[PDB]
Design a protein around this nucleic acid. Structure first.
Lengths: 52, 111
DNA sequence: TATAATGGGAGCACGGATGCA
């Protein structure tokens, strides 16, 4: 994960950081012999786009 | 070499989708499905083999296969997709037939 | 036209001419 923007608020002896964070969460999909992958390596898909 | 399950299903899929693509190009271009199929097959097999088919209304010669090929390539990208599909379909057909030749022998040895 | 099946089976004798080592 990488922090894009960092907002800082000074309170007492402490600072509160509001972090805008960007990361990636992996999910595996097991492909059976009777199925074929319709998507290339490193391709960017969207919601509703068919992978397998 | 003999195929595997995934390879077999792959080639079969490409063949079926290839025939479907030929039907699609028939619907689009307005030509004869047989003619289109024979032209695609002609381009897949290459310059090695060209011959007139009894079923076709027109004689099949490299001039004609070039005319029809260039007529198919003049289609828009989405319509030009079915051409690639049909080509890879024919290739898959060739590989599929070539892969199963042993079975024929094992069956014919009993006859 | 639909389980899956994938590489066979038999069976003397001397000459000229050419091919090869």
């Amino acid at each position: 994960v990488r922090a894009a923007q960092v907002e800082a608020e000074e309170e007492g002896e402490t600072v509160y950081l509001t972090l805008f964070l960007e990361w990636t969460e992996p999910k595996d999909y097991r492909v059976q012999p009777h199925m074929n992958v319709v998507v290339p390596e490193g391709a960017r898909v969207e919601a509703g786009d068919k992978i397998v | 070499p003999l195929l595997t399950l995934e390879e077999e299903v792959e080639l079969a899929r490409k063949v079926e989708e290839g025939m479907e693509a030929i039907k699609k190009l028939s619907e689009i271009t307005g030509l004869d499905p047989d003619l289109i199929r024979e032209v695609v097959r002609a381009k897949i097999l290459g310059s090695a083999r060209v011959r007139h088919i009894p079923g076709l209304k027109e004689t099949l010669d490299p001039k004609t296969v070039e005319e029809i090929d260039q007529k198919l390539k003049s289609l828009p990208k989405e319509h030009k997709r079915y051409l690639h599909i049909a080509r890879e379909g024919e290739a898959a057909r060739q590989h599929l037939i070539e892969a199963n030749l042993r079975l024929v022998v094992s069956i014919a040895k009993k006859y």
